Design an enzyme around this catalytic site. Structure first.
Site, PDB file in Angstrom:
ATOM      1  N   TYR A  47       9.386 -32.845  28.238  1.00 31.19           N
ATOM      2  CA  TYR A  47      10.256 -32.901  27.067  1.00 31.19           C
ATOM      3  C   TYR A  47      11.729 -32.748  27.463  1.00 31.19           C
ATOM      4  O   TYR A  47      12.607 -33.362  26.854  1.00 31.19           O
ATOM      5  CB  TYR A  47       9.848 -31.861  26.024  1.00 31.19           C
ATOM      6  CG  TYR A  47       8.556 -32.200  25.296  1.00 31.19           C
ATOM      7  CD1 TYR A  47       8.317 -33.483  24.815  1.00 31.19           C
ATOM      8  CD2 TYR A  47       7.577 -31.236  25.101  1.00 31.19           C
ATOM      9  CE1 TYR A  47       7.125 -33.790  24.151  1.00 31.19           C
ATOM     10  CE2 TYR A  47       6.393 -31.530  24.443  1.00 31.19           C
ATOM     11  CZ  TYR A  47       6.171 -32.806  23.972  1.00 31.19           C
ATOM     12  OH  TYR A  47       4.984 -33.087  23.314  1.00 31.19           O
ATOM     13  N   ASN A  52      -1.119 -36.500  22.088  1.00 30.12           N
ATOM     14  CA  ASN A  52      -1.462 -35.426  23.022  1.00 30.12           C
ATOM     15  C   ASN A  52      -1.420 -34.038  22.394  1.00 30.12           C
ATOM     16  O   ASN A  52      -2.364 -33.265  22.542  1.00 30.12           O
ATOM     17  CB  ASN A  52      -0.575 -35.491  24.281  1.00 30.12           C
ATOM     18  CG  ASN A  52      -0.606 -36.857  24.939  1.00 30.12           C
ATOM     19  OD1 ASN A  52      -0.136 -37.840  24.361  1.00 30.12           O
ATOM     20  ND2 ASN A  52      -1.175 -36.934  26.143  1.00 30.12           N
ATOM     21  N   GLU A  53      -0.338 -33.726  21.683  1.00 28.91           N
ATOM     22  CA  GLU A  53      -0.205 -32.410  21.072  1.00 28.91           C
ATOM     23  C   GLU A  53      -1.151 -32.267  19.896  1.00 28.91           C
ATOM     24  O   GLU A  53      -1.653 -31.183  19.633  1.00 28.91           O
ATOM     25  CB  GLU A  53       1.236 -32.128  20.635  1.00 28.91           C
ATOM     26  CG  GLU A  53       2.290 -32.316  21.741  1.00 28.91           C
ATOM     27  CD  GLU A  53       2.142 -31.348  22.919  1.00 28.91           C
ATOM     28  OE1 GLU A  53       1.203 -30.514  22.942  1.00 28.91           O
ATOM     29  OE2 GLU A  53       2.992 -31.410  23.841  1.00 28.91           O
ATOM     30  N   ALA A  54      -1.408 -33.366  19.202  1.00 30.14           N
ATOM     31  CA  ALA A  54      -2.385 -33.348  18.114  1.00 30.14           C
ATOM     32  C   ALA A  54      -3.787 -33.052  18.647  1.00 30.14           C
ATOM     33  O   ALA A  54      -4.582 -32.350  18.005  1.00 30.14           O
ATOM     34  CB  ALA A  54      -2.367 -34.662  17.377  1.00 30.14           C
TER      35      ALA A  54
END
Ligand SMILES: Nc1ncnc2[nH]cnc12
EC number: 3.2.2.22
Length: 278
Positions: free
Chosen positions: A115, A171-173
Protein backbone atom coordinates in the site's frame (compact mmCIF):
# COMPACT_ATOMS: atom_id res chain seq x y z
CA UNK A 1 14.79 -17.58 -6.41
CA UNK A 2 11.70 -17.26 -8.60
CA UNK A 3 8.17 -18.31 -7.62
CA UNK A 4 6.98 -21.71 -8.84
CA UNK A 5 3.59 -22.85 -10.16
CA UNK A 6 2.28 -19.33 -10.78
CA UNK A 7 0.91 -20.86 -13.98
CA UNK A 8 -0.45 -23.91 -12.11
CA UNK A 9 -3.15 -22.53 -9.78
CA UNK A 10 -4.52 -24.80 -7.04
CA UNK A 11 -7.94 -23.41 -7.97
CA UNK A 12 -9.56 -20.56 -9.89
CA UNK A 13 -12.33 -18.34 -8.50
CA UNK A 14 -14.43 -16.35 -10.96
CA UNK A 15 -16.65 -13.31 -10.44
CA UNK A 16 -18.74 -11.41 -12.99
CA UNK A 17 -18.48 -7.73 -11.98
CA UNK A 18 -22.14 -7.16 -12.84
CA UNK A 19 -23.39 -10.07 -10.69
CA UNK A 20 -25.48 -9.81 -7.53
CA UNK A 21 -24.40 -9.04 -3.96
CA UNK A 22 -25.24 -12.63 -3.03
CA UNK A 23 -23.06 -13.95 -5.87
CA UNK A 24 -20.22 -11.75 -4.63
CA UNK A 25 -20.60 -13.19 -1.14
CA UNK A 26 -20.60 -16.71 -2.60
CA UNK A 27 -17.47 -15.86 -4.60
CA UNK A 28 -15.58 -14.58 -1.54
CA UNK A 29 -16.77 -17.51 0.62
CA UNK A 30 -15.56 -19.98 -1.97
CA UNK A 31 -12.08 -18.50 -2.01
CA UNK A 32 -11.84 -18.82 1.79
CA UNK A 33 -13.19 -22.32 1.57
CA UNK A 34 -10.59 -23.44 -0.96
CA UNK A 35 -7.68 -21.72 0.81
CA UNK A 36 -8.37 -23.25 4.18
CA UNK A 37 -6.40 -25.80 6.12
CA UNK A 38 -9.11 -28.42 6.70
CA UNK A 39 -7.26 -29.49 9.86
CA UNK A 40 -7.09 -26.04 11.41
CA UNK A 41 -10.01 -23.77 12.31
CA UNK A 42 -10.21 -21.21 15.11
CA UNK A 43 -13.67 -20.40 16.47
CA UNK A 44 -15.11 -21.92 13.27
CA UNK A 45 -13.12 -19.58 11.05
CA UNK A 46 -10.70 -21.12 8.54
CA UNK A 47 -6.94 -20.74 9.00
CA UNK A 48 -4.58 -20.73 6.01
CA UNK A 49 -1.90 -23.41 5.96
CA UNK A 50 1.57 -22.14 7.00
CA UNK A 51 3.96 -20.73 4.43
CA UNK A 52 6.20 -23.58 3.22
CA UNK A 53 9.65 -23.05 4.80
CA UNK A 54 12.88 -23.16 2.77
CA UNK A 55 11.37 -22.97 -0.73
CA UNK A 56 10.24 -20.10 -2.98
CA UNK A 57 6.49 -19.34 -3.03
CA UNK A 58 5.06 -22.37 -4.83
CA UNK A 59 1.35 -22.34 -3.95
CA UNK A 60 -0.84 -20.05 -6.07
CA UNK A 61 -4.47 -19.58 -7.01
CA UNK A 62 -6.20 -17.55 -9.71
CA UNK A 63 -9.01 -15.04 -9.49
CA UNK A 64 -10.76 -14.25 -12.77
CA UNK A 65 -12.76 -10.99 -12.91
CA UNK A 66 -15.20 -10.73 -15.84
CA UNK A 67 -16.93 -7.62 -17.24
CA UNK A 68 -19.68 -9.92 -18.52
CA UNK A 69 -20.59 -13.66 -18.39
CA UNK A 70 -19.08 -14.03 -21.89
CA UNK A 71 -16.20 -11.56 -21.54
CA UNK A 72 -12.70 -12.95 -21.15
CA UNK A 73 -11.62 -12.05 -17.65
CA UNK A 74 -8.71 -10.34 -15.99
CA UNK A 75 -6.65 -13.05 -14.28
CA UNK A 76 -5.02 -12.34 -10.91
CA UNK A 77 -2.16 -14.44 -9.56
CA UNK A 78 -2.40 -14.58 -5.78
CA UNK A 79 -0.36 -16.55 -3.24
CA UNK A 80 -2.35 -19.35 -1.57
CA UNK A 81 -0.38 -19.06 1.69
CA UNK A 82 -0.85 -15.37 2.53
CA UNK A 83 -3.30 -14.18 -0.17
CA UNK A 84 -0.77 -11.73 -1.63
CA UNK A 85 -1.45 -10.44 -5.15
CA UNK A 86 1.78 -10.55 -7.17
CA UNK A 87 0.62 -10.79 -10.79
CA UNK A 88 -2.13 -10.03 -13.31
CA UNK A 89 -2.75 -11.10 -16.90
CA UNK A 90 -3.86 -8.51 -19.48
CA UNK A 91 -5.95 -9.22 -22.60
CA UNK A 92 -2.88 -9.46 -24.87
CA UNK A 93 -1.56 -12.37 -22.79
CA UNK A 94 1.08 -10.40 -20.89
CA UNK A 95 1.69 -11.43 -17.29
CA UNK A 96 2.41 -8.28 -15.30
CA UNK A 97 4.15 -8.57 -11.92
CA UNK A 98 4.34 -6.38 -8.80
CA UNK A 99 7.77 -7.62 -7.74
CA UNK A 100 10.72 -7.56 -10.18
CA UNK A 101 12.09 -11.02 -11.05
CA UNK A 102 9.49 -12.94 -9.03
CA UNK A 103 7.27 -14.54 -11.69
CA UNK A 104 8.85 -16.45 -14.61
CA UNK A 105 8.35 -14.62 -17.91
CA UNK A 106 6.38 -11.78 -16.32
CA UNK A 107 6.78 -8.06 -17.07
CA UNK A 108 7.30 -5.66 -14.14
CA UNK A 109 4.40 -3.21 -13.98
CA UNK A 110 6.61 -0.35 -12.77
CA UNK A 111 5.50 -0.08 -9.15
CA UNK A 112 5.49 -2.32 -6.06
CA UNK A 113 2.61 -4.22 -4.48
CA UNK A 114 2.51 -2.69 -0.98
CA UNK A 115 0.00 0.00 0.00
CA UNK A 116 2.98 2.31 0.58
CA UNK A 117 3.93 1.62 -3.05
CA UNK A 118 0.37 2.02 -4.34
CA UNK A 119 -0.92 4.90 -2.16
CA UNK A 120 2.10 6.49 -0.49
CA UNK A 121 0.78 5.45 2.93
CA UNK A 122 -1.39 2.70 4.53
CA UNK A 123 -3.47 5.58 5.94
CA UNK A 124 -4.94 6.53 2.55
CA UNK A 125 -6.89 3.24 2.51
CA UNK A 126 -9.88 5.17 3.89
CA UNK A 127 -9.78 7.31 0.73
CA UNK A 128 -10.34 4.48 -1.74
CA UNK A 129 -13.81 4.42 -3.29
CA UNK A 130 -15.27 0.91 -3.31
CA UNK A 131 -18.21 -0.06 -5.49
CA UNK A 132 -19.40 -1.85 -8.60
CA UNK A 133 -18.31 0.78 -11.10
CA UNK A 134 -14.95 1.16 -9.34
CA UNK A 135 -14.46 -2.60 -9.67
CA UNK A 136 -15.41 -2.60 -13.36
CA UNK A 137 -13.13 0.34 -14.19
CA UNK A 138 -10.29 -1.36 -12.30
CA UNK A 139 -10.71 -4.61 -14.26
CA UNK A 140 -10.91 -2.62 -17.51
CA UNK A 141 -7.78 -0.56 -16.77
CA UNK A 142 -5.60 -3.58 -15.93
CA UNK A 143 -7.09 -5.94 -18.53
CA UNK A 144 -6.54 -3.28 -21.18
CA UNK A 145 -2.82 -2.85 -20.46
CA UNK A 146 -0.57 -3.64 -23.43
CA UNK A 147 3.16 -4.44 -23.47
CA UNK A 148 3.74 -2.23 -26.51
CA UNK A 149 2.21 0.88 -24.90
CA UNK A 150 4.87 3.53 -24.27
CA UNK A 151 5.54 4.54 -20.62
CA UNK A 152 3.00 6.93 -19.12
CA UNK A 153 2.78 8.60 -15.70
CA UNK A 154 -1.01 8.96 -15.92
CA UNK A 155 -1.35 5.30 -17.02
CA UNK A 156 0.78 4.27 -14.02
CA UNK A 157 -1.34 6.30 -11.63
CA UNK A 158 -4.44 4.65 -13.08
CA UNK A 159 -2.90 1.20 -12.68
CA UNK A 160 -1.91 1.86 -9.05
CA UNK A 161 -5.46 2.93 -8.23
CA UNK A 162 -6.85 -0.11 -10.08
CA UNK A 163 -4.63 -2.57 -8.18
CA UNK A 164 -5.56 -0.86 -4.90
CA UNK A 165 -9.27 -1.23 -5.71
CA UNK A 166 -8.90 -4.97 -6.38
CA UNK A 167 -6.79 -5.55 -3.25
CA UNK A 168 -9.59 -4.16 -1.11
CA UNK A 169 -12.45 -5.75 -3.03
CA UNK A 170 -10.82 -9.14 -3.55
CA UNK A 171 -7.89 -9.81 -1.21
CA UNK A 172 -8.95 -7.87 1.89
CA UNK A 173 -12.54 -8.99 1.43
CA UNK A 174 -11.31 -12.58 1.47
CA UNK A 175 -9.38 -11.89 4.69
CA UNK A 176 -12.12 -9.95 6.50
CA UNK A 177 -15.83 -10.50 6.86
CA UNK A 178 -16.09 -6.84 7.81
CA UNK A 179 -14.66 -5.84 4.45
CA UNK A 180 -16.47 -8.45 2.36
CA UNK A 181 -19.73 -7.47 4.07
CA UNK A 182 -19.10 -3.77 3.51
CA UNK A 183 -18.43 -4.33 -0.20
CA UNK A 184 -21.37 -6.69 -0.71
CA UNK A 185 -23.55 -4.00 0.85
CA UNK A 186 -22.52 -1.55 -1.87
CA UNK A 187 -23.53 -3.97 -4.63
CA UNK A 188 -27.10 -3.47 -5.87
CA UNK A 189 -29.35 -4.47 -8.82
CA UNK A 190 -29.46 -2.22 -11.89
CA UNK A 191 -32.79 -0.70 -10.80
CA UNK A 192 -30.83 0.88 -7.91
CA UNK A 193 -28.61 3.98 -8.34
CA UNK A 194 -24.86 3.42 -8.77
CA UNK A 195 -23.25 3.35 -5.33
CA UNK A 196 -19.88 3.61 -3.62
CA UNK A 197 -18.38 4.05 -0.18
CA UNK A 198 -15.14 4.13 1.77
CA UNK A 199 -14.00 2.03 4.72
CA UNK A 200 -13.75 3.50 8.20
CA UNK A 201 -10.81 3.47 10.58
CA UNK A 202 -11.73 0.14 12.17
CA UNK A 203 -11.48 -1.73 8.86
CA UNK A 204 -8.31 0.15 8.01
CA UNK A 205 -6.77 -1.01 11.32
CA UNK A 206 -7.94 -4.59 10.70
CA UNK A 207 -6.47 -4.63 7.19
CA UNK A 208 -3.19 -3.24 8.55
CA UNK A 209 -3.07 -5.80 11.39
CA UNK A 210 -4.25 -9.06 9.81
CA UNK A 211 -1.36 -11.01 11.37
CA UNK A 212 -1.93 -9.37 14.77
CA UNK A 213 -5.68 -10.13 14.77
CA UNK A 214 -5.04 -13.69 13.57
CA UNK A 215 -2.46 -14.32 16.30
CA UNK A 216 -4.73 -12.75 18.91
CA UNK A 217 -7.51 -15.24 18.18
CA UNK A 218 -5.12 -18.19 17.81
CA UNK A 219 -3.71 -17.59 21.30
CA UNK A 220 -7.21 -18.21 22.69
CA UNK A 221 -7.13 -21.80 21.37
CA UNK A 222 -3.94 -22.66 23.23
CA UNK A 223 -4.37 -25.10 26.09
CA UNK A 224 -3.33 -23.28 29.30
CA UNK A 225 -0.28 -24.39 31.35
CA UNK A 226 -0.93 -26.24 34.66
CA UNK A 227 -1.63 -23.85 37.54
CA UNK A 228 -2.63 -20.99 35.23
CA UNK A 229 -5.92 -19.73 33.78
CA UNK A 230 -7.00 -20.24 30.12
CA UNK A 231 -6.06 -17.40 27.75
CA UNK A 232 -8.60 -14.61 27.32
CA UNK A 233 -8.83 -12.61 24.09
CA UNK A 234 -6.84 -9.35 24.20
CA UNK A 235 -8.81 -6.51 22.58
CA UNK A 236 -7.27 -4.58 19.70
CA UNK A 237 -9.13 -1.32 20.30
CA UNK A 238 -8.29 0.40 16.99
CA UNK A 239 -9.91 -2.50 15.16
CA UNK A 240 -13.12 -2.21 17.16
CA UNK A 241 -12.52 -5.82 18.17
CA UNK A 242 -12.83 -6.45 21.91
CA UNK A 243 -13.88 -10.11 22.23
CA UNK A 244 -13.05 -13.46 20.60
CA UNK A 245 -16.64 -13.55 19.31
CA UNK A 246 -16.01 -10.19 17.65
CA UNK A 247 -12.66 -11.45 16.33
CA UNK A 248 -14.34 -14.50 14.78
CA UNK A 249 -17.09 -12.37 13.20
CA UNK A 250 -14.33 -10.14 11.81
CA UNK A 251 -11.87 -12.70 10.38
CA UNK A 252 -12.73 -14.13 6.96
CA UNK A 253 -9.70 -16.40 7.04
CA UNK A 254 -6.75 -16.30 9.44
CA UNK A 255 -3.12 -15.99 8.41
CA UNK A 256 -1.20 -18.84 10.00
CA UNK A 257 0.84 -17.52 12.92
CA UNK A 258 3.11 -19.39 15.30
CA UNK A 259 1.98 -18.56 18.82
CA UNK A 260 3.55 -19.95 22.02
CA UNK A 261 1.95 -23.32 22.76
CA UNK A 262 0.16 -23.32 19.41
CA UNK A 263 0.83 -25.30 16.23
CA UNK A 264 4.27 -24.91 14.63
CA UNK A 265 4.76 -24.35 10.90
CA UNK A 266 5.87 -27.96 10.41
CA UNK A 267 3.08 -29.48 12.49
CA UNK A 268 0.33 -27.38 10.90
CA UNK A 269 1.57 -28.30 7.41
CA UNK A 270 1.68 -31.94 8.51
CA UNK A 271 -1.99 -31.83 9.54
CA UNK A 272 -2.78 -29.94 6.34
CA UNK A 273 -1.16 -32.63 4.18
CA UNK A 274 -2.78 -35.41 6.22
CA UNK A 275 -6.21 -33.93 5.55
CA UNK A 276 -5.61 -33.91 1.78
CA UNK A 277 -4.33 -30.36 1.53
CA UNK A 278 -2.11 -29.25 -1.35
N1 LIG B 1 -0.17 -7.05 -3.01
C1 LIG B 1 -0.91 -7.23 -1.90
N2 LIG B 1 -1.61 -8.38 -1.78
C2 LIG B 1 -2.35 -8.57 -0.67
N3 LIG B 1 -2.50 -7.77 0.38
C3 LIG B 1 -1.79 -6.64 0.23
N4 LIG B 1 -1.71 -5.58 1.11
C4 LIG B 1 -0.89 -4.67 0.53
N5 LIG B 1 -0.43 -5.05 -0.64
C5 LIG B 1 -1.00 -6.30 -0.85
Amino acid sequence: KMAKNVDKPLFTATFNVQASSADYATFIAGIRNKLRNPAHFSHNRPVLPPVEPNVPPSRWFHVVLKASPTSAGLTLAIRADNIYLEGFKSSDGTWWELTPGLIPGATYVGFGGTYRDLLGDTDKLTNVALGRQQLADAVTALHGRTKADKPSGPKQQQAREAVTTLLLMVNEATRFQTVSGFVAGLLHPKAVAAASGKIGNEMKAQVNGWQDLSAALLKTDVKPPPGKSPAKFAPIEKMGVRTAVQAANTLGILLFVEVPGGLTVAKALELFHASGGK
